[PDB]
């Protein structure tokens, strides 16, 4: 598997205002079509890890978090795996206030 747009995938620092939505993408291809899982600060990102939970759209390779709160701060990492290899990218999320 391989990043489709490796130049956008160099971006790592993301800041977003509270109570809005953060969206992270990691688009890929890889024979056979790889699957994607998400990590938060190293650990597996699971639905109960934040209040709203999180939504996905695999078909557009994206993790989504609505209503962000200062505790959503941290590192988010997409893992893309097929039978033949795993690729790895981290975004860093910051939350702005007022």
């Amino acid at each position: 598997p391989y990043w489709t747009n490796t130049e956008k995938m160099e971006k790592r620092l993301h800041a977003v205002p509270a109570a809005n939505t953060v969206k992270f993408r990691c688009p890929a291809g890889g024979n056979p079509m790889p699957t994607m899982r998400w990590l938060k600060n190293g650990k597996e990102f699971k639905q109960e890890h934040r209040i709203g939970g999180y939504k996905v759209r695999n078909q557009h390779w994206s993790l989504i978090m609505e209503s962000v709160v200062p505790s959503d701060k941290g590192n988010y990492t997409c893992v893309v795996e097929n039978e033949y290899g795993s690729i790895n990218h981290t975004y860093h999320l910051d939350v702005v206030e007022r």
Partner: antibody
Amino acid sequence: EVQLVESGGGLVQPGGSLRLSCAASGFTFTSTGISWVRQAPGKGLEWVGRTHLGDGSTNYADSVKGRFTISADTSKNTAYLQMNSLRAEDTAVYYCARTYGIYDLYVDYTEYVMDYWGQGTLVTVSS
Amino acid sequence: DIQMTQSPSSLSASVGDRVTITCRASQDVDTSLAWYKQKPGKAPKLLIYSASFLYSGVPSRFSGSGSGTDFTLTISSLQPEDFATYYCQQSTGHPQTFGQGTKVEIKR
């Protein structure tokens, strides 16, 4: 309950001015935004403009730039549309909508979602 | 601008019917597309955002799909309160534009 109540509507003269108000309850928009969209009687929806307090951006439909001004008062939890130099074709129901953003590094823009609208106030411009 | 074209403009469907309304954009809008429902005299209500996300409180019989320049709003089993006018709206960095609307009448 999330509520948005619009007031300030009415019949006003061409060349004249009007201030619409958008009072919010059940939520604050200190870090989100407010949009205005209008609907001429019998017609479809027309975006008027938007201010986002979280990202600091303000933008208007070309048909409305420089005549209409969108502001907010956090103290009053209220948003405003100052309409100056009104013409007959500004005649419409004006809606305000709570507006948040989808922030994605992957693209060039903030995708804004107008998820909750007030019931609207009717503005009639006529001599 | 980014022109949005809805089809059909108006339609007559029976209760329980499956209804499809399509929205085409004059250029690629990705999945940056929202659908609104509006009953006459009231504010529009958001049904779907980002092409396929169902908004809170919106019944699951509404679903959205599409990307690029083609989008569809689906109503699987048309209920009596679903009779209204439906609007799509693209939400790119280009100035926001709406479709002209699709009005759904009740057949009897």
